[PDB]
Design a protein around this nucleic acid. Structure first.
Lengths: 103, 100
RNA sequence: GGGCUGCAUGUGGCAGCUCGGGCUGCAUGUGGCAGCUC
């Protein structure tokens, strides 16, 4: 009603060696382990974020090094602190913009 | 495959003192009397042509003194002979041009 | 895709008009039609 609701520990930040694959390819990578609520990815970028339902889901994605990291040559971390807070600020802004689009 | 089929007596030429109204207006004026097929009208011209399905349609239009001649100060005539012939050459040329 | 309208909406858009473009397949002096992307 008011947008995604905050929980801490659900934001995965991915850095890749090659340019990132289609939003569905990235989502389906992690969806193989946990429910992915959202994939925030400029196509062809080498960094993106993925938001998860619960802290344990994001942790389980973080912990699949062979399945994910070594297949896709990715580094993955969970945001915390001010980096987390600023990502949730970006969520807010992105939603506001989409909701105020003219037409 | 080859366009409209020649019928004699189906081409009315319209002459006007002032510029003609839009092609939709000319078409409606005619169609409330007879079955119009085509209205050949260059925007703003003083003359135009209208082609009907049958000779009788065209004659009903020229006989509608009430409904046209007095409401719009138009002179009308049904082409025949060499003028009619040239108007059909004009049809052929227009068609070939739009196809190209 | 532009205009409008409703809806959904960080979740990836939907629909109805309406106007005009790109690819196509028919029609066609008969003033285009149907599709697919905008």
């Amino acid at each position: 009603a008011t947008g995604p609701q905050f929980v801490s520990g659900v934001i995965v930040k991915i850095i890749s060696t090659e340019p990132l694959p289609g939003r569905k390819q990235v989502r389906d990578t992690m969806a193989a382990i946990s429910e992915v609520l959202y994939v925030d990815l400029l196509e062809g970028d080498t960094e993106c974020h993925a938001r998860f339902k619960t802290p344990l889901d994001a942790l389980a994605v973080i912990n699949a090094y062979t399945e994910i990291n070594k297949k896709h040559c990715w580094k993955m971390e969970i945001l915390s602190g001010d980096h987390e807070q600023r990502y949730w600020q970006k969520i807010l802004v992105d939603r506001q913009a989409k909701l105020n689009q003219p037409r």
